[PDB]
Amino acid sequence: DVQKTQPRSALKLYQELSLLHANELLLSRGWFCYLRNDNHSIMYTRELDGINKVFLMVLNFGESSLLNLKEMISNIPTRVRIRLSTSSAYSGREVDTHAVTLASGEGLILEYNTGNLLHRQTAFKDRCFVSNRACYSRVLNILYSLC
Amino acid sequence: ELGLFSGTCIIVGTIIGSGIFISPKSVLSNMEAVGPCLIIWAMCGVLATLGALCFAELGTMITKSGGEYPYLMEAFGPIPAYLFSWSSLFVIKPSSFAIICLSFSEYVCAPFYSGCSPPQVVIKTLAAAAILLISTVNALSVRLGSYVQNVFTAAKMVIVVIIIISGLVLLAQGNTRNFENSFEGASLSVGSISLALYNGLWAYDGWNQLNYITEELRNPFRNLPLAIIIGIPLVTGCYILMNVSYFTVMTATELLQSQAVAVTFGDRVLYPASWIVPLFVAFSTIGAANGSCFTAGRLVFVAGREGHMLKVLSYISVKRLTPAPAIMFHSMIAIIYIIPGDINSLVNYFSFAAWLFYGLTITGLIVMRFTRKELKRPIKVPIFIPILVTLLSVFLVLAPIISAPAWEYLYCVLFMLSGLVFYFLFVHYKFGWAQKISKPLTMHLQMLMEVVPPE
Amino acid sequence: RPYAGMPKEVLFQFSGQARYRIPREVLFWLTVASVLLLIAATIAIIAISPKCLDWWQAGPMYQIYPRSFRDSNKDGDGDLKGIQDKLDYITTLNIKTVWITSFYKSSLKDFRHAVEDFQEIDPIFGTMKDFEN
Amino acid sequence: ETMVYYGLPFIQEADFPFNSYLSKLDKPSGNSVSEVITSWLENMPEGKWPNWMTGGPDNVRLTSRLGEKYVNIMNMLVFTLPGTPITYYGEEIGMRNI
Ligand SMILES: CCCCCCCC/C=C\CCCCCCCC(=O)O[C@H](COC(=O)CCCCCCCCCCCCCCC)COP(=O)([O-])OCC[N+](C)(C)C
Ligand SMILES: CC(C)CCC[C@@H](C)[C@H]1CC[C@H]2[C@@H]3CC=C4C[C@@H](O)CC[C@]4(C)[C@H]3CC[C@]12C
Numbered sequence A: 001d002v003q004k005t006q007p008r009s010a011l012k013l014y015q016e017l018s019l020l021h022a023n024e025l026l027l028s029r030g031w032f033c034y035l036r037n038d039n040h041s042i043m044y045t046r047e048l049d050g051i052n053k054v055f056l057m058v059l060n061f062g063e064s065s066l067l068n069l070k071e072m073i074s075n076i077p078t079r080v081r082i083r084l085s086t087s088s089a090y091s092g093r094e095v096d097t098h099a100v101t102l103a104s105g106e107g108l109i110l111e112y113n114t115g116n117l118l119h120r121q122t123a124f125k126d127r128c129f130v131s132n133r134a135c136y137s138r139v140l141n142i143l144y145s146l147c
Numbered sequence B: 001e002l003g004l005f006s007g008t009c010i011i012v013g014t015i016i017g018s019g020i021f022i023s024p025k026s027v028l029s030n031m032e033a034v035g036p037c038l039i040i041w042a043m044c045g046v047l048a049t050l051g052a053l054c055f056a057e058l059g060t061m062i063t064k065s066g067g068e069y070p071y072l073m074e075a076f077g078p079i080p081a082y083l084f085s086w087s088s089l090f091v092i093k094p095s096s097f098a099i100i101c102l103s104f105s106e107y108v109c110a111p112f113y114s115g116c117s118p119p120q121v122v123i124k125t126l127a128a129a130a131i132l133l134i135s136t137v138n139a140l141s142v143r144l145g146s147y148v149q150n151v152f153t154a155a156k157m158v159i160v161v162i163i164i165i166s167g168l169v170l171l172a173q174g175n176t177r178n179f180e181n182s183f184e185g186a187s188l189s190v191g192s193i194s195l196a197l198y199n200g201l202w203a204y205d206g207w208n209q210l211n212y213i214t215e216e217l218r219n220p221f222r223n224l225p226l227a228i229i230i231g232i233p234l235v236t237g238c239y240i241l242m243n244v245s246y247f248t249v250m251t252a253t254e255l256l257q258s259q260a261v262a263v264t265f266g267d268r269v270l271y272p273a274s275w276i277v278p279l280f281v282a283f284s285t286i287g288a289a290n291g292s293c294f295t296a297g298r299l300v301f302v303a304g305r306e307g308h309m310l311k312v313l314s315y316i317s318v319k320r321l322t323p324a325p326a327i328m329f330h331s332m333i334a335i336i337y338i339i340p341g342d343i344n345s346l347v348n349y350f351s352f353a354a355w356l357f358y359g360l361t362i363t364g365l366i367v368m369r370f371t372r373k374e375l376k377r378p379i380k381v382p383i384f385i386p387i388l389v390t391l392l393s394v395f396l397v398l399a400p401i402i403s404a405p406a407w408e409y410l411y412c413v414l415f416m417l418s419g420l421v422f423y424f425l426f427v428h429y430k431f432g433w434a435q436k437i438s439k440p441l442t443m444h445l446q447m448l449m450e451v452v453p454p455e
Numbered sequence C: 001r002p003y004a005g006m007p008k009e010v011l012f013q014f015s016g017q018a019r020y021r022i023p024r025e026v027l028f029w030l031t032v033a034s035v036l037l038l039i040a041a042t043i044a045i046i047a048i049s050p051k052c053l054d055w056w057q058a059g060p061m062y063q064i065y066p067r068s069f070r071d072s073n074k075d076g077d078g079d080l081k082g083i084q085d086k087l088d089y090i091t092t093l094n095i096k097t098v099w100i101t102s103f104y105k106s107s108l109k110d111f112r113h114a115v116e117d118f119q120e121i122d123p124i125f126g127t128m129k130d131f132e133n
Numbered sequence D: 001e002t003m004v005y006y007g008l009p010f011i012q013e014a015d016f017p018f019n020s021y022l023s024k025l026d027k028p029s030g031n032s033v034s035e036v037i038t039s040w041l042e043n044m045p046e047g048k049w050p051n052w053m054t055g056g057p058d059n060v061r062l063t064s065r066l067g068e069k070y071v072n073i074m075n076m077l078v079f080t081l082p083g084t085p086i087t088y089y090g091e092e093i094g095m096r097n098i
């Protein structure tokens, strides 16, 4: 009863994630490319072919950090929008890829547009996972398994 | 001649169509409970009997070849007769052709998409391929029109008794859990009751085109009101005995999941051969579409005399006596209807325009019977049945727009008034330049499509 | 010569070849080529479309310990009637599956279990009709 | 031995065996969580479905195992990973052991 009135609670975030996971079509059957990770931080992207938009989750399990994403992903613009955050302070605030800070248990769902997907390259065929590959068609608005 | 037993066997086969396979999902998604959505099939089933009875009166006293265009000419003058000829060429007839062919691809592509809904591009590409094939066969030939009709009405009735017998046997085995606690969440409102009468009445579409049978009836005046008051009430009894056979098998929450309701039923009850339902229903649904395309050239002929609709549309091709310009124009409007809308946004759009002209007709019944016309009428209906059909239809046309407004109604009202503009600027005033746009058009079309005036 | 109202014999002169003959067969063969290219396109879309996700792949599960969720009859132990009361809370989490741990008639409710009858509900959880509701 | 329950391409078996390896982490380190993710996903057969279970009735609750500061980072983890997330009652509000 208390947690469903508070604006930034564990129950409120849980209802935002299970709704985002329900109707996204990118979280349910998108690729999973696990980018490199030092200790104290985890980064992975979810991406589909014809969607033209990728998610980037940066989860910090360490002390704190100021990490520059432009060197790591090499696919990201310099201004990305925060689709979700665990501290919930970043509701719709955009951040600078050059300097993002994560406060010891912070997770972000960054979301941006790109045409260069990580699983299509050659250096990432060893670290991308999908159960049943399926590309997307914008003109037909369907998933198709031929691609 | 045809007796009374055959006097109903034509009308009962006419009423039951592809509406009983598509509407249950839509009438239940507005009643929310098994109890009330069973009284809608009776309430609209009775309202369809008083409609067809009132149409028996106008069909005997006027006694003209036109279907319903005469009845508005005889009562209100030339503007509603034209306004109906306008809408029944751009709204009522094309959209009813698009709903029957949109509901044939819901049943062909439902088995290949088991467990989930098929994409919209599949059920429109398959509907657009049915409209073009149904309208091309009915233009090249006439024998093939009536070749496959008597078989397509067999599959229609074979399934209707298979669903009923199975839904009754299962009721003896005590599968009563679904309608045990009915009415519990009933959302009765002028919003829902109206929108649920649209979809329930669409399953009865075909009661107005029932007057042609009197010509071969053995004793028309004595038997036709009998063949109607025992024929249609026999069909509404076969709908609640078929909608009950749905809720006996599946629950109210699984109904709204699938658009093809009878496909969900054949998997649950007829597992060894469950493909029989999507195969037989696809037969009957493409047979009911064949009946719509046959009558497309009918009304344009009678309206082509009074110079209301263009006379080129009634021209017949010489190689094959088929109304080619009427058909290929009747389908080309349907293709433009399946693109924007889907079944639920078209049953509302159709049953809206169709029901205002259904009202104006039976008000003209009493208005002619009240003041203007004193001619003899062979069969007479009591005064209380027409005043109900008009007071009901005035609720059906006017409650949905105010309570549940939608963009489908706007495009429907803009269509008729657009025809009202074509009245004054083309037929009422008879401008000089208006003629020189018609004459070179008709014969060039005749030149290109080798069609010829009928008589 | 046109005289727009034209019976059979007259127009057969004009409609023979002059210009209006080749559009007829090229438009008649267009609608035929398209009809078998729309029933060919829909088969090509039904075939390449991948199977949709089952109910256990689509949404999260929610594991309930039935003796600790919601008590209905004030006896101090949760039961299957209390799980049914809170089903509207479970659908605000967008849960798809409710996974209830073991509730059979047991003589030992831990140490992985000791079931006395695999086809009965334990009294502290309700009766066999509380489960069907 | 767990991945045998996924079955073979011609003999079908469990739809997935429940992944309880996230429920074992007692210290929230980046390489401890990263090792569980890559160990399940590379050992899994080809066209199978993963699942991520971060708690159960038989282990200390997440707030008492890692800390209250890790309740949110741990629900965002299992909801963006591929597969089915399996939630234990009271992990959405951040319960703790008595
Ligand atoms: C008059 C009667 C009309 C027909 C009635 C109905 C007939 C059928 C009645 C009944 C269905 C019979 C049982 C079917 C069970 C399922 C079988 C199955 O999935 O097979 C597929 C065969 O693979 C295919 O590609 C199948 C293609 C199907 C094309 C359908 C016809 C479209 C045009 C119709 C004519 C239109 C004419 C219009 C003008 C008249 C499996 O392939 P897959 O790759 O394993 O899975 C791919 C699909 N998923 C499962 C992933 C989603
Ligand atoms: C015109 C009609 C009668 C022709 C079809 C006749 C045969 C094929 C039909 C008529 C009635 C049908 C039965 C009706 C009800 C049931 C009970 C159900 O739990 C299993 C199928 C079963 C047992 C059906 C099997 C097929 C059946 C025997």
Ligand SMILES: CC(C)CCC[C@@H](C)[C@H]1CC[C@H]2[C@@H]3CC=C4C[C@@H](O)CC[C@]4(C)[C@H]3CC[C@]12C
Binding pocket: B120, B121, B124, B125, B128, B335, B338, B339, C027, C030, C031, C034, C038
């Ligand atoms: C008669 C000859 C000359 C031309 C025939 C053209 C026909 C086959 C074309 C013209 C426009 C087309 C439509 C254009 C857009 C859509 C919407 C899409 O979501 C499903 C397919 C659908 C509905 C197409 C079906 C095929 C279609 C109707």
